[PDB]
Structure 1
């Protein structure tokens, strides 16, 4: 939640997500070769319920960008931003947030804060998505 907002911490964010991927890989090597109703599974479920809130927050964090990619792929985004350079205004981006109707006000404002803009009060969705959606894909797949 903190590194994403600042533009100068993207490299550290990527390193962190690589660490996340490695830890989930180890957690799956835990379950490799597990019987039904195994003590390993019981202990990991206990771990998850102990750390429930953090898991929820991580899942919501991933789901933001998972829905962001779908919104970008949606045709309403193109009808709001017909041009090819793709530098949408922040104002148009916000009205697209509420036109999507899948994004609450909190998610909209968090994406506003995480988004980086030039002096023209405008952001580029291509830069935004390549920065955030693709890194989340494989770690989210590992968690799933």
Structure 2
């Protein structure tokens, strides 16, 4: 955070916050490029997965930056400018998930971005603890999550419709509805039940 002993201070955490911000902005740019064509090409796959690995590594740093709950680092990064990139990644998540789900071959990159979401909320949960009761950090958490709150609809629809997917596909009129008891169910009859 500071290097007390040296003359000129260097706050290396704010620099890599800015680096994540630039990474996020260019990931958003990649999204706007593929936002129209929507059949994602293998070169864009192979490039963008590597970019997701980059983002995963830097979120792993940001976890282990504040994984020890040292409060000066909390006060620094909570004040810091990363919160735009939070909202931007959430936008990226919600708007990628749709076409990643709708396409067969894109499940690998869906696994990648899924994993990035996992590390995203790991980092958020890590920095989301140091609260007496409310905290100005807690204020800012809730406020910018509410500022995010359009795409949250999409990710919760995504989660519940892949969740009670798994729940209802053992229910009353599925498991016997196939003749084999195996899942050779016709998809229109699947829609119907």
Coarse TM-score class (shorter-chain normalised) = 0.5 to 0.7
Matched, 1:4 2:101: yes
> In the alignment, which of 20, 25, 36 is matched to residue 117 of structure 2?
20
The answer as to whether partners of 1:30 and 1:40 remain within 8 angstroms in 2 is: no
Give the whole-Å Cα distance in 2 for the aligned partners of 1:3 and 1:30.
29
Matched, 1:35 2:132: yes
Answer 1 or 2: higher relative contact order, Cα 8 Å, separation at least 6: 1
Structure 2 unaligned segments of length 5 or more: list them: 1-97
Structure 2 equivalent of residue 67 of structure 1: 164
Number of matched pairs: 96
Taking only aligned residues, the RMSD between alpha carbons, in angstroms, comes to 1.2
Give the whole-Å Cα distance in 1 for the aligned partners of 2:146 and 2:139.
11
Structure 1 runs of 4+ aligned residues shifted over 2 Å read: none
Structure 1 unaligned segments of length 5 or more: list them: 97-144
Matched, 1:93 2:184: no
Partner SS for 1:4 = helix
Select the structure that is richer in strand: 1
**TM-superposition CA deviations, 1:30-67 (whole Å, max 9, x none):** 11232211111111111111110111210111000111
